[PDB]
Give the backbone structure.
Amino acid sequence: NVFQTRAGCLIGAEHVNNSYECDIPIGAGICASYQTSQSIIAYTMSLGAENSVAYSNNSIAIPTNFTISVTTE
Amino acid sequence: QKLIANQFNSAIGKIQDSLSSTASALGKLQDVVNQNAQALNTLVKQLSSNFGAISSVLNDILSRLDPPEAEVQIDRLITGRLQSLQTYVTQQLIRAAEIRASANLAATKMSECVLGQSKRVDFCGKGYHLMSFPQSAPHGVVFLHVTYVPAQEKNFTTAPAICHDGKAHFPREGVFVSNGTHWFVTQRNFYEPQIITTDNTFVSGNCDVVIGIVNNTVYDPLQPELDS
Amino acid sequence: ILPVSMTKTSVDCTMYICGDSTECSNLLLQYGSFCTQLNRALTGIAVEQDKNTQEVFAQVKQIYKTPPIKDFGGFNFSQILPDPSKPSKRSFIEDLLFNKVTLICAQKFNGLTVLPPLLTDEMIAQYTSALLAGTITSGWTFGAGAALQIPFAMQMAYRFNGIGVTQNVLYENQKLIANQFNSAIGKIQDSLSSTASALGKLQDVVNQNAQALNTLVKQLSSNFGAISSVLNDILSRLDPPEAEVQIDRLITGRLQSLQTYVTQQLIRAAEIRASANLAATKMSECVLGQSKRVDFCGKGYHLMSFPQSAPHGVVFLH
Ligand SMILES: *[C@@H]1O[C@H](CO)[C@@H](O[C@@H]2O[C@H](CO)[C@@H](O)[C@H](O)[C@H]2NC(C)=O)[C@H](O)[C@H]1NC(C)=O
Ligand SMILES: *[C@@H]1O[C@H](CO)[C@@H](O[C@@H]2O[C@H](CO)[C@@H](O)[C@H](O)[C@H]2NC(C)=O)[C@H](O)[C@H]1NC(C)=O
Ligand SMILES: *[C@@H]1O[C@H](CO)[C@@H](O[C@@H]2O[C@H](CO)[C@@H](O)[C@H](O)[C@H]2NC(C)=O)[C@H](O)[C@H]1NC(C)=O
Ligand SMILES: *[C@@H]1O[C@H](CO)[C@@H](O[C@@H]2O[C@H](CO)[C@@H](O)[C@H](O)[C@H]2NC(C)=O)[C@H](O)[C@H]1NC(C)=O
Ligand SMILES: *[C@@H]1O[C@H](CO)[C@@H](O)[C@H](O)[C@H]1NC(C)=O
Ligand SMILES: *[C@@H]1O[C@H](CO)[C@@H](O)[C@H](O)[C@H]1NC(C)=O
Ligand SMILES: *[C@@H]1O[C@H](CO)[C@@H](O)[C@H](O)[C@H]1NC(C)=O
C-alpha cells in the first residue's frame, strides 16, 4: 500500500484507475479524495468531464428557453 | 415576465441558503481578515523572542546589567525587533497592494456591472449579464450578478443565405434556421422563429459566390397589399 | 504572450540556514517565527501559482473536442488543433513554443525544492484544446452556457458584425478570407521558428526566478563576516561560545538573505498575479467572447482568438 507518484511517495492511499474531478489536489494531476470501507483514494484527476459537440457545417443549435441565474462574487 | 420574476425571485432565495449553510463562500473576505490578524500575532510574538539577547524582556537586561552591557544586548533586541517591523511593514505594503488591486476590480464591477450593463464576457459572472446588486460585507463587498443563461436547445438546419430570385438574402439579425421543412429566421439567443420576409433580410449581390446558400421563397409583406 | 504562473518553489528555512547543526538550529530557535513565516509566505505564493493557472485555463466546464472530420468552410486549423499523433497532444504550434523556451536538481540542493504545478503541461494542453475546440464549433456561447454547435463560417459571420462589417461581406468573400487566414497562421510558425525574441517575456520570467535562486544559493558561500562560510568549520575549529558569535553572523546573514529572496518573490509573484488576470481576462473576453475593447485583443478590430499554452505562460493568437 504505497503508490509512487509523479509528486512523491504517497503512503496510505489506494491508487484508482478511475478518474474523477479533483478534490484535494496533490501534484502533477493526482487528486486524492476520501470516499470509497472507505479510504483515501488518489487518482489522476479528470480535467473536466468530457463532451464533444456534434459539429456539422449546416447544423445550428438555438436555445429555446433560458434561465436567470444569480451568482455571487 | 411572470416566469422571469419567479426565476429571479426563486434565484434570490438560494443565495440565503448558499450563504447560510456554507462558511466556504466567503473564504476570500474571511481570509484577508485572517492574514492580517495572522500577521499581527506574529508581530507580537516577536516581542517575546530573544534574538540572541539574554532575555526578551527589555527591562530585565536593564535591571540585571550595567548599561554598557545592556548596550550591546539591547542592540540585538532593537536590531531584532526593528527588523521584525520592517518585515511586518513590508508584508502589509505588498498585501495592501493586493487589495488595492482588488478594490479597483470592485470599483470597476461596481461601475460597469452595477451602474451599467456589462458586455465584457464573464466579467460579471458566467452568462450574459443582466444587472447586479452590491451588498456590502465586512471589509468587502458582494455582488449578486443576475445573469441570463440559456437552456434548452433544439438542433436545426441553418443556411447562411437564401437565393431568392438569384439574389441572396441574408438575415438582417440572427441566423436562418429551419426545422427541416420551412425556413425561419430567428434571433440568435432565443429560438423564436419568424417567417422570412424582406424585412428580416437584406440582399447582397447574386447567389453563387455564397458557399452554402439554399433555396426558398422570401415572402413579400407588400404583395398582399398590392394583391388588391 | 503572457506569463501566467511561475515556478513554484518552496524553501526549507532551517536546513538552508542551518546545515546539520542543532547548535545552529538552536540559535535559529531564537529568532523564532521567521523560519516558519517564510514557509507561510512561500507557500502563499506557491498556492496561488496554481490558482492562476486554474483561472486562466479552466474556465471551461467540459473538456470538448473537435469533430473527427475538419470541415470549417476552409479555414485550416491543423496547426493549432491538438496533434493526435503526438504522444502528449500539443498541437504543432504549441510545440514550437516548448522548444523555444528552456539544473532542476542543481537549485534543489540546499532545501530549495521545486514542488510540481497542480496542473501538468499535459493537462494544460487539454484545456486549451477545449477552449479551442469550443471556440471553433460552438461559437462563443460555450462560455455563456451549453455549447451550441454553429457552423464556423456562420460564426465568422457574427464575429464580423461585432466589428461593424455587415456579414454579406464574409460569405461573399469567404474563400479569400480563408486563405488570408490560412496563410496568416503559417507565418506564425516562422515568426516563432526563426526568432527567439518573440517569447522574451516567458523566457524572462523563467530566468529571473532561476536568476534569483542562484543568488540565493551563492549566498551560502559568503562569509557575512563570519570566519568562514562553511557552518561546520566554525563548529569544528572553535569552541562554541566562539562559534556562537560567529554563527550569528551566518544565521543573521543567511536569514536576512532569505527575506530578500522571499520578498523578491512576493513582489514578483504579484507581478504575475497581475498578469494572470490579464490573461484570465483575455481568455475570457477575447477567446470566449468577441472583444470590443480596442487594442486589447491586438491591433485592429478583433475576430477571435486561439489560446495556446506555452511553458509557464499562455499565448494567444488574436
Ligand atoms: C422554460 O423553462 C422553464 C424552466 O426553466 C419552464 O418553466 C416551467 O414550466 C413548466 C411547464 O411549462 C411549469 O410546470 C413550471 O411551473 C415552470 N417552472 C417555473 C419555475 O415557472 C418553462 O415552461 C419553459 N418554457 C418553455 C416554452 O419551454
Ligand atoms: C417546422 O415548423 C413549421 C412551423 O410550425 C411547421 O409547419 C407547420 O406545421 C404545423 C404542424 O401542425 C402545421 O399546423 C402548420 O400549418 C405548418 N405551417 C405551414 C405553413 O404549413 C413544420 O411542420 C415543422 N416541421 C416539423 C418537422 O416539426
Ligand atoms: C436552388 O434552386 C435553384 C433553382 O431555382 C437551383 O438552380 C439550379 O441549379 C442547377 C445546377 O446548379 C441547374 O442545372 C439548374 O438550371 C438551376 N435552376 C435554375 C432555375 O437556375 C439550385 O441548384 C438550387 N440550390 C441547391 C443548393 O440545390
Ligand atoms: C491544413 O494545413 C496543413 C498545414 O498547412 C496542411 O498540412 C499539409 O498538407 C499537405 C497536403 O496539401 C501535406 O502534403 C503536408 O504533409 C501537410 N503538412 C504538414 C506539416 O503536415 C493540411 O493539408 C491542411 N488541411 C486542410 C484541410 O486545409
Ligand atoms: C488499471 O487499469 C488497467 C486497464 O484499465 C489494468 O490493466 C490495470 O491492471 C489496472 N491497475 C490498477 C492498479 O488498477
Ligand atoms: C442534435 O444532434 C446531435 C447529433 O448527435 C445530438 O448530439 C444532440 O443531442 C441533438 N440535439 C437534440 C436536442 O436532440
Ligand atoms: C457540409 O458538409 C457536407 C459533408 O457531408 C458537404 O456534403 C456539404 O457540401 C457541406 N455544405 C456546407 C453548406 O457546408
User: Anything to note?
Assistant: The first strand of chain B starts at residue 128 and ends at 137. The interface with chain C takes residues 42, 45-46, 48-52, 80, 87, 90-91, 94, 97-98, 101, 105, 119-123, 126-128, 149-151, 153, 155, 158, 160-161, 168, 170, 175, 188, 202, 204-205, 209-213 of chain B (CB under 8 Å). The beta strands of chain B are 128-137, 140-148, 153-157, 170-171, 176-178, 183-185, 201-202.
